[PDB]
C-alpha cells in the first residue's frame, strides 16, 4: 500500500481527489468508482474543479485536462507551493509568503499579494463567482489572528477581521461565499463571521482540552459545519440557529494518528426496514463521508432532529479497491 | 530665476526644502536663512527629516548628510520614484504600483506592498513612532473607487480598510501624532477626516462652491486646524476643535493663478498690535501661517482663533533671492 | 508512523528528545514545535544538554552538533550502551558492568568505575556543576546500596543503604542537594540528603503492585513526580499521602511507557479553553507527560488545592 499525501473532495462534495507517492487517483461518491488514475510519481497537491476534467498537480504547478490527456500549462514558482484552490473564475496559488491569483480562463497573471509568512498554507476560497471572495491569515511581522478578507472579483481587500487572539489554525467558506468559520491553534473555540459585514454570527466550543484541528467544511446548503481533529472524532455544528449538535466516532481499530477530512451531503431517503435505527419505512438521513489518511472511507447518517452519535453504515478502501 | 519643481516643509513645519532644475536649497522659517544649497543638477524630490541633517534626493534615490557632506547610501528602483516620506523610524519610497519600506537606521529593506496603480503618488505618513501608520489608496483594477489601505509600519501588517470616498482620492494627510487622517476626492468638494484607530469619520467639511483641484492637505502641530490649498488661488482653514471653512487665505491679486501652493500652520505666537492695526491690547496671540507657492514666494498670514475670517498678510519674501 | 525507540526531556524539562527507528526529532514544550529532525536511521539513545546544540547518538556512541551539522567524535564500547546523562562539566556512559566518565569539553577519559551488573541501566546525575555528583546502585555479587560518586574529584563520597530490595528508579534534584529512590515493589519513596545521607522524606504510592518507572524533581525541587505502569502519575510535595494525581485519558494505548517533568509555574488563559476549566489568568504549575505512543500531554495543578489535575492539551509527536 503506497503512502498517500493528499485527500480532498471537490467543491461540491460529490467526488474524491487523492495523491499517492506513486501517482494520483480520482474517485466518485454515490455510484462509487475510479474515474481516473495515473502512475507518474509523488504528488503533493491534487485539486479539481466542479468535475469538468480540470486538475492541478503539484509534485512532492501543472494543470492537466484528464479527458483530453493534454497539458494546458505549467507554472513555476521560486518557493514550494503550500495550497491551491479553484473556482470556475479564478486560480489561486499560495506560497509561504506570497499569494498568486490567476484567471482560470485566460490563465494570465492578475494579482500578487505579499503576506506575512504562513508555514501552514492556510486558505479559504468562495467557490461561487457571484460572491468570489478570498481570505488568508495576517500574522504580525495581540494581533495574531487577523484575517484579510480579499475580494477576487475586483482584486482589492474588503475588510480586516480580528478573528482570534492566537494563530489561526483552519478556515473555510460556505458554498455561496456568505459565511466564514475560523479556529485558533488551540481548537477550543469555533467562530463564524459574516464576510459581508464582518460581525461574528456564531461561536462554537469544540472539545474540552486544546487539541489540533485538521480541516473545517460547510455543508452545500450551509446548514451544518464539520470539524475534524486529533481526537479521532468528528463534530458537527448546526448553523440553523455552543456544544456540537452531533458527533462522529470512528471505529476503535482506526489508528489515532490519521488525518481526517469530511463533507456533508444533501439529505436523501434511506430504508429503515433494512437498518434498525432504533418506524416509518423511509426517513431522510443526512449523509456524511469521512476519509482518513490511512486510506479508508466511512459513511455515516445524521438525524437533523435527534442528532447525537451517528450510526455508521459502510466502509471502503480508497487504496486498492 | 531657475524653475522649481518641488517644495515641502519638514515634519514639524519649521524648515523649507526646495528643488530647482539646477540644484536644491534648504531654508528656515522664524529666523529666516539659507542653511544649505548645492548646484548639482535637477532635483524632483527633496525631503528632510526633523532637521538632523538627513535628506532624500531624487534626480530629475540618494540619501545625503548635509553636515558631513557624505553619502549614507544609494538605492535604485526599476521605475521613477513618485513620493518619499520619513519619520524617525521608517523610510517609505513609492513607485506607481509598488511601495518600499525601509528602516531609517539600518537602511535594510523591511517590506514591499503591491498596490493598484497610483499615478498621482499619494500617501500620508505619521511622523511619530508611537502611532507609525502609512495610508495609501487602493482603487479597483480594470462605486468603491476611493478605498484607502491603513498600513501599520511598526508590525508591517495592514490594520483596516477605509471606504473613504466614492471617487478617486486626491490628497491625504496624517496629523503629527498619527491619530487622524484626512482625505480629499478628485472633485475637492468634500473633505473627510477619519480617526485611524477606530475608523469612524469624525468631521466632514465642504470646500468652496464649485468643484476644483486640491494640491495638498496638512494638519496643525496640535491638530487644531487643517489647511487645504486649491486651484482657485485660495487657501482654506478648517477648525478641528469641534462644515464651512473657518478662515480663508486670499493671496495678493497680482499673483499668477497657475501656481502650486502648499501651506503650514504654526503654534500661536505673540504679535504687537501697535505696529499692526488689526482692527486693542498691545499684544495678542495670532496663529502664523506660511504659504509658499511654486512661483517662488513665501507669504505670512495671521488668524485670530476666535474671530477667524479673512486673514491679514504681514510680509512677503522671495525664495531664490 | 515509524516506531520510536527513545523519549526523554532535557535537563530543564523544556524540550523533548525523541529518536525513532528512522531518525530522531527535537521538540519544545511551551511553544510546541519541531526544532530539528534527521531521517538518518535507527537511534537508541538521543540525549541533549541544556539546549546548546549538543547531542549524543546511540545506534539501535557519536556526539554531534546540530547547528554546525558536524561530528565532534565517535567512541566505541565493548558492550551495548544502556544510559547516557550529561551536565555542563562531565559526560558519563553506563554499560552493563562498567561506568565511563568523560570530560565534556576535552573528550579525554577521566575515570572508569567497575560496578556490579546493572541490567536496568540505572544511574542519576546532578545537572549543576556546583555539586556535580553521580549516584548508581551497588547490588551484591544489602541490595539497595547507592554509591554517591563525586565527579568533581573522581572519588566516591559515601554509601547509602537506601532500600532493602532492588532499586527501581533514582533521580537527583537540579541543585544536586537531594536524591530520591524507589524500591522494586514501588510502594515507598525515599529522599536522601546527598551531603550527609540522612533520610528526609518518605512517600506512599502504588496501593497494588504497580512498578515505578521514572522519578523526577521540579526545578525548585518543590515537587516530585513518579510515573508507573498504572497509567496514573503521582505528585509529592517536598514542603506520606500524594499531593496530586494525573489520569491519562482512557482512550490512549495502554502498551506505553510514560515519563514526566514539572516546570516553573506559568499563567494560562481561561478564554482559550471554554469547555474545561470554566480571573482571566491563574498561576498553575505545568506538568508535561510524554508516552511512547507518540503523544505529549500537558497538565496543570493548583498549588494549594492539588487533587486530580486537568489536561489542557494533547499534541501529537511524529507529526
Author numbering:
A (entry chain C): 5 to 64, 75 to 155, 222 to 321, 409 to 445, 458 to 500
B (entry chain A): 5 to 64, 75 to 156, 222 to 321, 409 to 445, 458 to 499
C (entry chain D): 5 to 64, 75 to 155, 223 to 320, 409 to 447, 459 to 499
Paper text:
Autophagy-related protein 18 (Atg18) participates in the elongation of early autophagosomal structures in concert with Atg2 and Atg9 complexes. Atg18 belongs to the protein family of β-propellers that bind polyphosphoinositides (PROPPIN). The corresponding primary structure contains a series of conserved WD40 repeats forming the 6 or 7 blades of a β-propeller fold. The autophagic membrane adapter Atg18 reveals an unexpected structural plasticity in multiple modes of oligomeric organization.
Interestingly, once dialyzed into the low-salt buffer (100 mM KCl), Atg18 formed large supramolecular structures when imaged in negatively stained EM samples. Using cryo-EM of vitrified Atg18, we identified helical tubes of 260 Å diameter including a diamond-shape repeat pattern along the helix. We acquired cryo-EM micrographs of wildtype Atg18 (Atg18-WT) and subjected them to segmented helical image processing. 2D class averages of the helical tubes revealed individual Atg18 propeller disc-shaped structures including individual blade separation. The assemblies exhibited a pitch of ~100 Å with 5.1 helical units per turn. D Fourier shell correlation threshold at 0.143 indicates resolutions of 3.8 and 3.3 Å for the 3D structures of Atg18-WT and Atg18-PR72AA, respectively. The determined cryo-EM structures of Atg18-WT and Atg18-PR72AA constitute two main propeller interactions mediated by the T and I-interface between neighboring monomers. Interestingly, the lipid binding sites appear buried in the T-interface of the helical tube suggesting a stabilizing role of the involved residues. In line with the highest affinity, we found that PI3,5P2 binding leads to disassembly of the helical tubes.
